[PDB]
Design a protein around this ligand. Structure first.
Ligand SMILES: C[C@H](CCC(=O)NCCC[N+](C)(C)CCCS(=O)(=O)[O-])[C@H]1CC[C@H]2[C@@H]3[C@H](O)C[C@@H]4C[C@H](O)CC[C@]4(C)[C@H]3C[C@H](O)[C@]12C
Ligand SMILES: C[C@H](CCC(=O)NCCC[N+](C)(C)CCCS(=O)(=O)[O-])[C@H]1CC[C@H]2[C@@H]3[C@H](O)C[C@@H]4C[C@H](O)CC[C@]4(C)[C@H]3C[C@H](O)[C@]12C
Ligand SMILES: C[C@H](CCC(=O)NCCC[N+](C)(C)CCCS(=O)(=O)[O-])[C@H]1CC[C@H]2[C@@H]3[C@H](O)C[C@@H]4C[C@H](O)CC[C@]4(C)[C@H]3C[C@H](O)[C@]12C
Ligand SMILES: C[C@H](CCC(=O)NCCC[N+](C)(C)CCCS(=O)(=O)[O-])[C@H]1CC[C@H]2[C@@H]3[C@H](O)C[C@@H]4C[C@H](O)CC[C@]4(C)[C@H]3C[C@H](O)[C@]12C
Ligand SMILES: C[C@H](CCC(=O)NCCC[N+](C)(C)CCCS(=O)(=O)[O-])[C@H]1CC[C@H]2[C@@H]3[C@H](O)C[C@@H]4C[C@H](O)CC[C@]4(C)[C@H]3C[C@H](O)[C@]12C
Ligand SMILES: Nc1ncnc2c1ncn2[C@@H]1O[C@H](CSC[C@H](N)C(=O)O)[C@@H](O)[C@H]1O
Ligand code: MET
Ligand SMILES: [Cl-]
Ligand SMILES: [Cl-]
Length: 346
């Protein structure tokens, strides 16, 4: 019974078996109750503020060849770009002028910047009195250390899949063990650290999803980014099935139940597969939103997956749009940098 599973989640009985059954039950009434539980937990622990992280995707150059990603090195049907350090800093300034209190710098694994150009950019943005989050991939400890000394606050490095076999197959340059080592290094260096995974990868099972949830709970991540897999036509996975929105939403809800004081975005991928999908996600456990702040003409060239919603609008439209979203949801914008506010419990 769904009722029994809900009771067990409510009492914090987070066994493998409970999680598996929650993900396996397809009943509408159960799912809606699960979503309501996560929404309530979100409200009680992290409140009504929705934190805005403005993302600048500053280079689509990548040395890796992940099978799912549109930026993989083997994709020749992509115009590659690099923003200059001045462009990046001034674009960050504009986001701060528009009210962003975190700047996220994301790129492919592009050697050109690493480490010192990033450090210089980070230092310049930090003068603006905002949080800086980096999402640059896997690099040596030394690079992560340099970026932390330069002032970076947070680092996003999704674990992608906690199944090491599937991880190696989908990310043939690397391994789950290296991904985890990177995440542990970032935690040690004092970053607020984000992990997370895709849902509906080819070959991924429900037990794999359970393992993702248990992995997240084990390491107590500050942020967890979850979205559906969306096949990209210029990759080896072009003909595979999209991830299911409802199942992905259940993963967000369960993440909030498991990690009640974490920061959890309503990802752009959720809003790509279903119209209004970010808004739904913000009502099922999420409390962060990441408006795209990549300028034209580059924005349209950073498509990890196709259909990305933000590609066609004026490049200053996203921050105002998310502020409207937050209001029509009956929520409030974040007042501070939206760092993790731990609630210690039992
Ligand atoms: C209550 C009203 C009017 C019913 C009527 O005609 N009177 C009907 C009209 C359209 C219905 C929604 C849509 O179906 C989409 C979606 C289907 C899911 O399954 C369940 C949730 C949801 C949001 C539905 C909820 C509800 O049921 C709606 C609002
Ligand atoms: C807006 C729609 C449709 C509601 C509706 O239209 N239902 C009939 C009329 C009800 N009214 C009270 C408006 C009038 C009753 C008098 S009447 O004469 O119309 O029957 C309702 C139906 C199911 C609801 C979702 C689920 O819960 C799961 C989840 C819980 C979270 O916490 C918040 C998010 C989420 C996704 C919910 C959002 C929203 O809330 C939904 C879509
Ligand atoms: C960038 C330009 C020119 C002036 C400028 O460079 N302004 C820097 C402001 C810096 N901050 C945001 C940190 C101020 C916070 C003050 S606050 O009192 O909100 O704490 C200013 C002039 C008018 C400002 C918009 C409007 O206002 C409406 C709206 C208010 C929301 O709220 C934030 C979003 C939005 C769209 C604003 C964005 C931006 O800002 C605008 C475009
Ligand atoms: C209306 C859209 C579908 C839009 C559309 O037409 N695109 C689909 C057609 C494409 N397909 C070919 C995939 C067939 C379907 C569907 C897709 C996902 C659905 C929500 C989720 O379940 C979660 C949640 C479950 C609750 O119970 C009721 C509320 C809620 C928010 C659901 C409402 C609605 O039901 C959604 C938005
Ligand atoms: C300028 C564009 C159009 C509109 C659309 C929604 C508006 C925001 C929301 O109303 C919530 C909130 C109300 C507060 O009063 C002042 C600030 C804030 C963040 C608004 C700023 C601005 O007005 C927005 C972005
Ligand atoms: N085809 C793919 N489908 C779905 N996701 C993919 C894909 N390709 C890489 N991603 C994901 O995007 C993450 C970067 S942040 C994405 C952002 N929040 C957004 O939703 O746009 C990577 O770590 C992957 O999990
Ligand atoms: C653009 S994909 C996300 C950033 C980084 N390349 C990573 O795979 O973690
Ligand atoms: Cl962040
Ligand atoms: Cl994310």
């Amino acid at each position: 019974t769904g009722r029994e599973i809900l009771e067990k989640l409510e009492r914090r009985e987070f066994t493998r078996e409970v999680l598996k059954e929650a993900l396996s039950i397809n009943d509408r009434g159960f799912n809606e109750a699960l979503f309501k539980l996560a929404d309530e937990i979100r409200r009680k622990y992290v409140g009504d503020e929705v934190h805005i992280r403005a993302i600048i995707e500053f280079s689509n150059v990548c040395r890796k060849n992940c099978l799912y990603c549109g930026l993989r090195r083997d994709n020749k049907n992509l115009k590659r770009y690099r923003m200059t350090p001045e462009e990046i800093v001034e674009r960050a300034r504009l986001a701060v002028q528009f009210g962003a209190k975190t700047i996220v710098l994301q790129s492919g694994e592009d050697p050109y910047y690493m480490p010192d150009v990033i450090s210089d950019i980070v230092k310049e943005i930090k003068k603006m009195g905002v949080a800086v989050t980096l999402s640059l991939g896997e690099w040596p400890r030394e690079y992560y250390e340099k970026w932390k000394e330069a002032g970076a606050d947070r680092y996003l490095l999704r674990h992608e899949t906690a199944n090491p076999v599937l991880h190696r197959k989908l990310r043939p340059d690397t391994s789950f063990e290296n991904r985890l080592n990177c995440l542990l290094t970032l935690k040690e260096l004092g970053y607020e650290t984000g992990a997370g995974s895709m849902v509906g990868l080819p070959g991924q099972t429900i037990d794999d999803l359970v393992d993702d949830l248990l992995f997240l709970k084990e390491h107590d991540f500050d942020m967890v980014g979850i979205g559906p897999f969306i096949p990209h036509p210029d990759t080896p996975l072009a003909n595979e099935k999209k991830g299911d929105f409802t199942l992905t939403l259940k993963m967000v809800a369960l993440t909030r139940i498991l990690l009640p004081d974490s920061n959890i975005p309503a990802t752009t991928a959720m809003g790509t597969i279903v119209p209004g999908g970010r808004e739904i996600t913000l009502r099922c456990g999420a409390n962060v939103i990441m408006p795209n702040w990549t300028p034209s003409p580059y924005r349209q060239l950073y498509q990890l997956y196709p259909g990305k919603i933000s590609v066609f609008e004026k490049d200053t439209a996203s921050i105002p749009s998310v502020m409207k979203m937050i209001e029509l949801l009956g929520r409030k914008p974040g007042r501070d940098w939206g760092g993790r506010k731990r609630v210690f419990e039992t």
